[PDB]
Design a protein around this ligand. Structure first.
Ligand SMILES: [Zn+2]
Ligand SMILES: [Zn+2]
Ligand SMILES: [Zn+2]
Ligand SMILES: [Zn+2]
Lengths: 332, 46, 183, 85, 78, 66, 66, 130, 206
RNA sequence: AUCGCUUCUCGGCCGGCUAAGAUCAAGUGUAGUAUCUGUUCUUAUCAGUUUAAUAUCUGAUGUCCUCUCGAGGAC
């Protein structure tokens, strides 16, 4: 017997969303990722009716997705974190109404792995170097520079390898025209495996480390480390240089902490709770995801709880020194 | 180069060959063995 | 203790002589009995290096699948003096096989083992798959019975055999088609 | 005495000389050239520009992997430029 | 009783149809059915060693029902 | 090819001079007493022409005659 | 092989083998969007909190060693 | 007939045949007979001869991709913890060969292993039922 | 109405016939593989379809020689006739005829929100043709991420007897030189090819 | 009819001469395996190493006293 397969209704589930300018237009095309599917939408400034410009199936499990831009560049490419051992850089040709495969690079084995990258994906604000990472042991970097014709060329990889180290999340860091930085959440289980008592199960804090790419030395050295008080799930870029301070926000259990280097001391704030809540007090809270709103005038952040509570995160700074943090209830 | 130590295999095969062909034909017997000549086969017999 | 270790398993029969020396028997007991997994081959603890040529000298050289036999190549392949060989170079004749390209475009299309629960080991060939209740053709011929084999009439009177106690043979406690009169 | 270097695979294309020209590196075979070889500039640099991946002569061509090593995914490991020990 | 003596056979019978033949009753552990070398043919009498004795005494009871080539087969203890 | 003739000629010579030696389902020569395998029958024959092969036939000789 | 995590050997313990297959299962859960969503459905949480609890269970699972 | 051993070279070369066949036929649905042949392949696992052991390795690798890991692993389970050192050396070598590739797809096929005192060996995630 | 199909959470299918007089529950067959089972469906009396918690679809058929009354860990089993990885977990399986006047087909939803169908072939011609489709398409039009199609559909279990329609339909999106040149490798025309794939969809579904 | 001898008959085992006519083919090296032959452990006990278990390897021959390995006494 033989069976021919047909899809009829394509999956409506949306795992990821990235907003960039893919046509070189002042409008913002929204590239969203259905489960096995790559998808491209066009919302309308006036009526807001969301036009689907493209829907394509990649025949592979999408893992993470990020959009980026060359420095001061006109247009935006796409980086596809995949389940294969290949990162691919894509460009949507507005005319042809379909994507082209701009770059195909093979960093390792196939399928969702423990040590194989593609899991977590970060990129520099200036688009110099994109950093790709697995859950454990392997963190790789591809450096990007436009060619003589200003068409994108990808470099050779690098290696961040650190033994027996779990990576919670990786977020690009803002340093304008500098040696790029990266915020890697890490933890070491090597303390836990050699501790028959079970003490290392507790009393082990996830280490926040900033790697520094260095163009001139063309390797990636561990530079910054601080132990995190409590375990946060994810991090947030804080645009630095001209606009705002350069630092990272850390979303932690029942807290958010701006935690940065230089002389900058950490700033913690509790995650506010609603008056007269019916839930188990034993159930804490963190934030799910965050979408930064970046404006030539100002900037802020948007956070959400399990319960769906979006807050507007703000920074109170003295010059480049942030003194405190202000969170106003935004919506739900 | 052909010269060397005598082997039980070469020696037994020499027995059988001498039995079959006869004493006066040496070139025929040297033909079967490897790494040995007719003179060497004859003098090895006698 | 190899004794009490046999009380902790659904199929303790899996535990064997050297099994009690295992570095982790308290698991291997639970693995070896896993549902569809297959046993380890037995040729070790036998020092014979997995084979000898005793039973292997009575085997046929080979026999073709019937699909290849009907073709007719078998008769085509079957002798030559040396000067005929240097004549075979100077003379040479062509087209000795002269196969039918229709036939060899036919057989393997138009015309043309074991399950997972089995694995081969050294000496095993015929036996497991002649048993009480299962005999060969010819010996049927010497016996000369038309389609029970008649001494399973006396397996009525004298009783079920001590040697194969689990026995069932047709018509008695085993309620039979072709050759096989007992299982 | 002779074994892979296995440094991280870069974007540099492999280069085989006259001798090694047709060989798929790992399977040692000439069959079904399909994909392409990548080795790090740490293995391929300078006097190694256009050098053979094996003997150390000038590369006249580029190595192609077989289909055999493709499905077994061996082409994705460290750079298969043999180093003498 | 572990062994039995078996008379009155035809040489087309061999050690195999004895193997198969008496294991129909109960397994023959050790088979002995002489091959005569001189004229290369069998006289047709057999000796059988079993696992233990019970096999072979049941074998005395049941055993002499076999008929090899239309003809009678002797089985007795030994 | 001349090499091919020797293989043929050294099998026949070890067939003439030859009851124990045989050829298995493969091509090798074997001594069925001693259960030895021989690269060439003549090489095998010598083992067949040896004093150890001799003994193990006598020992099996006695072992049967008992 | 050694530098490839999950490599086994003859001296491999139970505990290490099972904690391996655990951690690999968890990386699969982080990997496949759906199966993750199944988990979120069954036991009611966010996708986030699920992945968080898993990342907590990465080092521990089965608890202390022996 | 060949894999059943007259002499080692038969097992070796025949095994190589099983390899290239196994890569070639992949995905077309013939796996059954390849399983049957895998039966006769399987005893040859044990030997010290370099060419036959590396041959058998290539063999079982191709058979890995063609048959799928599940069946492989179902032949490779019991050998892991067996008391002897030999069997563990080898079955762990095999299990590694099966492990590096397709490590992603192995998850489903690890059997149920009961939990002892200090450790919980049951993965309960798979037992969540809607 | 005759037999009963047990679905294990782990060891998958257990064929169980209920003897009415003895009232006994009878396991006469089981699967050759462990599979984590979401739900089952009957294509017919002798076949069973099943989905994996991991998002696989298997179909296992009894041998026609099965013993209907009986009394390592089993006696006789059933061969696995199909393995296909959807990549999306399937919580229900239902066989039906989607459209009036259409051909009977198999139906699977998934957890991702997608709804799709499996369809039998009525001819070896469309069979082999779609085979060449899949073949020259794959290498000539690789998947987007660089991930291979074949492996992705063979992901947990190797593909057996399934042609992927969503790859065959991408014939539309290829460049006209791809479309044409491939059609030549297929010895057809873009209209021929295209309509011939519209055949199955049309006839069976929308 | 028997013995011996003989004759016939039947059955079974059951390559010419010459100057011998003249003349006479071997690659290498790096790794590695297999198959032949020859030769060695009647060691007793215990302890340790070691092995799946063997095997193997590694160490010594109830204690004290007296007399000339043996004898006696005390345990
Ligand atoms: Zn290198
Ligand atoms: Zn070269
Ligand atoms: Zn290759
Ligand atoms: Zn011998």
């Amino acid at each position: 017997m033989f069976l021919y397969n047909l899809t009829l209704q394509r999956a409506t589930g949306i795992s990821f969303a990235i907003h960039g300018n893919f046509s070189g237009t002042k409008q913002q095309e929204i590239v969203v990722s259905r489960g096995k599917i790559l998808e491209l939408l066009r919302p309308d400034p006036n009526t807001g009716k969301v036009h689907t410009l493209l829907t394509v199936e990649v025949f592979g499990v999408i893992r993470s997705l990020m959009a980026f831009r060359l420095t001061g560049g006109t247009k935006d490419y796409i980086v596809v974190g995949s389940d294969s051992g290949r990162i691919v850089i894509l460009e949507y040709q507005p005319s042809k109404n379909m994507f082209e495969k701009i770059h195909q690079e093979t960093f390792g084995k196939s399928g969702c792995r423990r040590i194989v990258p593609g899991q977590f994906l970060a990129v520099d604000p200036k688009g110099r170097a994109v950093m790709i990472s697995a859950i454990e042991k392997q963190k790789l970097v591809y450096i990007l520079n436009r060619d003589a014709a200003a068409r994108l060329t990808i470099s050779s990889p690098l290696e961040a390898h650190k033994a027996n180290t779990l990576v919670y999340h990786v977020v690009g860091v803002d340093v304008g025209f500098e040696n790029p930085m990266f915020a890697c959440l890490e933890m070491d289980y090597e303390e836990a495996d050699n501790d028959p008592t079970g003490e290392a199960a507790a009393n082990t804090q996830q280490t926040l480390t900033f790697y520094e790419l260095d163009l001139g030395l063309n390797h990636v050295v561990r530079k910054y480390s601080e132990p995190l008080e409590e375990h946060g799930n994810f991090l947030i870029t804080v645009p630095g240089g001209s606009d705002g301070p350069s630092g990272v926000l850390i979303c932690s259990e029942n807290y958010i902490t701006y935690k940065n280097f230089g002389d900058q001391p950490d700033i913690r704030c509790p995650i506010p709770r609603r008056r007269n809540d019916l839930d188990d007090p034993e159930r804490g809270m963190i934030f799910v995801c965050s979408a930064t709103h970046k404006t030539k005038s100002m900037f802020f952040f948007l956070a959400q709880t399990e319960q769906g509570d979006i807050f507007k995160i703000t920074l109170e700074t003295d010059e480049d020194m942030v003194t405190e943090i202000r969170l106003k209830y935004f919506d739900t | 180069i052909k010269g060397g130590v005598w082997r039980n295999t070469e020696d037994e095969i020499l027995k059988a060959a001498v039995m079959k062909y006869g004493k006066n034909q040496w070139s025929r017997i040297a033909s079967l063995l490897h790494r040995k000549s007719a003179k060497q086969c004859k003098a090895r017999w006698y | 203790t190899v004794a009490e270790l046999k009380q902790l398993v659904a199929r303790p029969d899996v535990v064997e002589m050297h099994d009690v020396t295992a570095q982790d028997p308290k698991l291997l007991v639970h693995l070896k009995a896993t549902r569809n997994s297959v046993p380890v081959p037995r040729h070790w603890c036998f020092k014979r290096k997995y084979l000898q040529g005793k039973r292997g000298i009575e085997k046929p050289p080979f026999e073709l699948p019937d699909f290849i036999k009907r073709t007719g190549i078998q008769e085509m392949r079957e002798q030559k003096t040396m000067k005929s060989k240097m004549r075979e170079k100077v003379r040479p004749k062509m087209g000795k096989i002269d196969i039918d390209y229709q036939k060899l475009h036919d057989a393997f299309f138009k015309w043309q083992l074991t399950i997972h629960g089995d694995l081969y080991y050294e000496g095993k060939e015929f036996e497991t798959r002649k048993k009480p209740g299962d005999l060969s053709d010819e010996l049927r011929i010497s016996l000369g019975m038309p389609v029970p084999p008649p001494w399973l009439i006396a397996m009525q009177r004298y009783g079920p055999p001590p040697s194969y106690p689990n026995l069932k043979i047709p018509g008695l406690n085993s309620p039979l088609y072709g050759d096989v009169f007992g299982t | 005495d002779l074994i892979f270097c296995r440094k991280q695979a870069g974007v540099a294309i492999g280069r085989l000389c006259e001798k090694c020209d047709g060989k798929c590196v790992i399977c040692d075979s000439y069959v079904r050239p399909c994909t392409l070889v990548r080795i790090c500039d740490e293995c391929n640099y300078g006097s190694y520009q256009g050098r053979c991946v094996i003997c150390g002569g000038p590369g006249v061509s580029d190595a192609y992997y077989c289909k055999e090593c493709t499905i077994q995914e061996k082409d994705r490991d460290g750079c298969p430029k043999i180093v003498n020990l | 009783d572990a062994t039995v003596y078996v008379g009155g056979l035809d040489e087309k019978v061999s050690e195999p149809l004895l193997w198969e033949l008496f294991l129909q009753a109960g397994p023959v552990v050790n088979t002995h059915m002489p091959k005569d070398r001189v004229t290369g043919q069998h006289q047709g009498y057999g000796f059988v060693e079993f696992l233990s004795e019970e096999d072979a005494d049941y074998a005395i009871k049941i055993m002499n029902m076999i008929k090899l080539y239309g003809k009678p087969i002797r089985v007795n203890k030994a | 090819s001349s090499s091919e003739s020797n293989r043929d000629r050294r099998e026949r010579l070890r067939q003439l001079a030859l009851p124990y030696f045989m050829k298995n389902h493969l091509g090798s020569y074997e001594c069925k007493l001693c259960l030895t395998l021989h690269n060439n029958e003549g090489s095998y024959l010598a083992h067949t022409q040896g004093k150890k092969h001799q003994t193990n036939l006598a020992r099996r000789a006695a072992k049967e005659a008992k | 092989q050694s530098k490839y995590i999950g490599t086994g050997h003859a001296d491999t313990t139970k505990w290490e083998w099972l904690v391996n297959q655990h951690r690999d299962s968890y990386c699969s859960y982080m990997g496949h969007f759906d199966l993750l969503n199944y988990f979120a459905i069954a036991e009611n949480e966010s996708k986030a909190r699920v992945r968080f609890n898993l990342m907590e269970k990465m080092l521990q699972p089965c608890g202390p060693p022996a | 007939d060949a894999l059943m051993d007259r002499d080692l070279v038969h097992r070796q070369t025949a095994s190589a045949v099983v390899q290239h066949m196994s890569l070639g036929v992949y995905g077309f649905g013939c796996e059954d007979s390849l399983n049957h042949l895998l039966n006769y392949v399987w005893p040859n696992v044990f030997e010290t001869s370099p060419h036959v052991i590396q041959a058998v390795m290539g063999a079982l690798e191709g058979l890995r991709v063609a048959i799928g890991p599940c069946r492989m692993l179902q032949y490779c389970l019991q050998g892991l913890f067996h008391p002897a050192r030999k069997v563990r050396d080898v079955y762990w070598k095999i299990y590694n060969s099966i492990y590096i590739g397709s490590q992603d797809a192995l998850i489903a096929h690890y059997p149920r292993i009961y939990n002892d005192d200090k450790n919980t060996y049951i993965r309960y995630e798979l037992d969540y039922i809607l | 109405g005759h037999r009963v199909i047990v679905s294990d959470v782990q060891e998958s299918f257990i064929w169980v016939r209920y003897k009415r007089n003895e009232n006994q529950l009878i396991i006469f067959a089981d699967d050759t593989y462990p599979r984590w089972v979401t739900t089952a469906s009957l294509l017919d009396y002798d076949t069973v379809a099943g989905a994996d918690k991991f998002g696989n679809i298997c179909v296992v058929r009894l041998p026609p020689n099965t013993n209907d009354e009986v009394d390592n860990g089993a006696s006789q089993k059933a061969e696995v006739i199909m393995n296909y990885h959807v990549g999306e977990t399937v919580l229900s399986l239902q066989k039906t005829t989607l459209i009036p006047g259409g051909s009977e087909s198999l139906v699977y939803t998934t957890l991702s929100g997608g709804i799709g169908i499996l369809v039998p072939f009525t001819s070896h011609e469309d069979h082999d043709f779609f085979q060449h489709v899949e073949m020259h398409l794959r290498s000539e039009h690789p998947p987007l991420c660089g991930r291979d199609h074949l492996s992705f559909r063979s992901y947990y279990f190797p593909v057996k007897n399934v042609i992927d329609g969503d790859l065959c339909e991408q014939f539309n999106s290829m460049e006209p030189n791809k479309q044409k040149n491939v059609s030549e490798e297929l010895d057809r025309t873009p209209p021929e090819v295209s309509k011939k794939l519209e055949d199955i969809r049309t006839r069976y579904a929308f």
